[PDB]
Design a protein around this ligand. Structure first.
Ligand SMILES: CCCCCCO[C@@H]1O[C@H](CO)[C@@H](O)[C@H](O)[C@H]1O
Lengths: 73, 441
């Protein structure tokens, strides 16, 4: 795979600035945090539930194990 | 005679100035023909986003009739005496000139005076030229070279008047009004902003009297609040890539910021550019060309053509090169080109610099061949340097250049500097800007 033989592209214009003309951390916080919150809210419903389940099974199972070895659960 | 004595035999250019500020300059020869014209400090750099394209629109109207010679009357008069009337606009200068028999100099000066001061600008003519300009915009779109150079200016001078094209955006062409034009004219076409130049078989005294006679009415005041001055234009290291795989060859233009017209460094830079040179598939030298870039390109078939350039503006400029090549040859071309700029910055040899100096000497003299090239040199020089630089001075400046001067001057403008890059066509292989930037050191 080599530049020049990848694929066909027509009518696209790309504008760029030298890295020396710009900031490396533009709006790092004033925008970074808000986007992180967006991305977090955006996935938490897909990611978190299964782990909350793990957490529950773990605490229940661990406590169940403890109680089971005692005289008076 | 030696090249040295020949240099000291060129008639000195004579310069005078009228009360209204108009400068009159001429170089007399014994040619039975001549070229006389008006050079003006007006161009798109002086335009704002609202009237960008105004100057070019005026160029379209300039020869369409004057109050004294309506319609095609001006045209008939020029043609009947066998003269030629031409014009051109750039981002900083505008010129209107006539080639005619030396004996017709009086009528030539009258016609120019008439053109520059009494242009009709008939509403119906303005509407016709509107369509002509739109069609010219479409034609220019088919010239990949013109497109890439307009793109280079757009990105290199982004956010400044120099980023603007001479022709202006199509919407400005559709909306510019006579009011806009007359306004542009009253503001820029003033005597202090013009130079009446002439070269050929004529005497300065005759030209001066003709100028007094025909240009005295030209305003030389304007005022104070309306004196269009130029602000420096910021250069930006950047890239603009218009990918169009439908085009057969890619065009690439790359440049670092140049010093501007007035700087002494331009001579050494011209020497360096002469070393790298130019090339195209029809050159007979091929593998034996002296320029490493030229011979590598020719033997390895790396491009159809390439050309170094030093485009100068008042206080800035574009120093670099343009090449046309196959979609699979862009990286190689950029690699060899940048390698050559670096070789000059760190290792220019006395012998190659001497070659560069000789190329420049030949280009300078062979360019001033004929009354038109000479007249243009007079007009432009007076606007840019404020004086005609004699060949003997150019030689002295060229003579001062050696390998040390070339390494130092090239290092100053090329070494570890951010370039402006413009690409158009099948450019998937045009190197990423970071890679191009790293190539600068
Ligand atoms: C790099 C050298 C900068 C100064 C070069 C000046 O050069 C001198 O200019 C005079 C006026 O144009 C000429 O009359 C004279 O013959 C020339 O040698």
């Amino acid at each position: 795979r080599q530049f020049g033989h990848l694929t066909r592209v027509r009518h696209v214009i790309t504008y760029s600035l030298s890295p020396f003309e710009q900031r490396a951390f533009p709006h790092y916080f004033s925008k970074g945090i808000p986007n992180v919150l967006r991305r977090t809210r955006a996935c938490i419903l897909r990611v978190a539930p299964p782990f909350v389940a793990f957490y529950l099974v773990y605490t229940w199972g661990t406590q169940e194990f403890e109680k089971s070895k005692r005289k008076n659960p | 005679a030696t090249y040295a004595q020949a240099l000291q035999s060129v008639p000195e250019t004579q310069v005078s100035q009228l009360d209204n500020g108009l400068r009159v300059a001429s170089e007399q020869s014994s040619q039975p023909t001549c070229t006389v014209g008006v050079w003006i400090d007006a161009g798109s750099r002086y335009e704002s986003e609202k009237n960008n394209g105004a100057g070019y629109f005026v160029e379209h109207l300039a020869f369409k009739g004057t109050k004294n010679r309506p319609g095609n009357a001006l045209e008939k008069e020029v043609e009947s005496m066998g003269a030629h009337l031409n014009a051109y606009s750039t981002r900083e200068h505008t010129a209107y000139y006539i080639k005619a028999l030396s004996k017709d100099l009086p009528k030539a000066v009258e016609l120019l005076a008439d053109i520059v001061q009494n242009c009709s600008l008939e509403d119906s003519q303005i509407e016709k030229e509107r369509d002509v300009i739109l069609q010219e915009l479409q034609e220019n779109d088919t010239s990949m070279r013109d497109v890439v150079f307009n793109y280079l200016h757009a990105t290199a001078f982004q956010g400044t008047p120099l980023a603007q094209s001479v022709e202006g955006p199509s919407e400005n062409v559709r909306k510019l009004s006579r009011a806009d034009l007359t306004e542009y004219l009253s503001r820029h076409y003033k005597a202090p902003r013009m130079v009446l130049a002439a070269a050929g078989g004529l005497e300065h005294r005759q030209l001066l009297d003709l100028a007094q006679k025909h240009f005295s009415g030209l305003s030389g005041t304007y005022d104070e609040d309306a004196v269009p001055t130029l602000s420096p234009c910021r250069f930006t290291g950047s890239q603009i890539c218009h990918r169009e795989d439908g085009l057969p060859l890619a065009h690439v233009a790359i440049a670092v910021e140049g010093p501007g017209w007035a700087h002494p460094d331009n001579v050494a830079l011209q020497v360096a550019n002469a070393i790298i040179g130019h090339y195209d598939c029809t050159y007979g030298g091929g593998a034996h060309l002296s320029s490493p870039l030229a011979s590598i390109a020719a033997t390895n078939k790396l491009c159809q053509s390439f050309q170094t350039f030093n485009i100068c503006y008042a206080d800035t400029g574009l120093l670099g090169a343009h090449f046309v090549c196959d979609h699979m040859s862009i990286d190689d071309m950029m690699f060899v080109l940048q390698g050559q700029w670096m070789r000059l910055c760190t290792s220019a040899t006395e012998s190659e610099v001497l070659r560069g100096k000789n190329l420049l000497r030949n280009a300078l003299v062979s360019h001033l061949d004929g009354t038109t090239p000479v007249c243009e040199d007079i007009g432009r020089s007076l606007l840019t340097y404020g004086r005609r630089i004699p060949l003997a001075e150019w030689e002295s400046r060229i003579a001062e250049v050696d390998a040390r001067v070339v390494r130092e001057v090239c290092s100053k403008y090329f070494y570890d500097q951010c370039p402006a890059v413009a690409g158009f066509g099948p450019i998937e292989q045009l190197p990423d800007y970071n890679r191009i930037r790293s190539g600068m050191f």
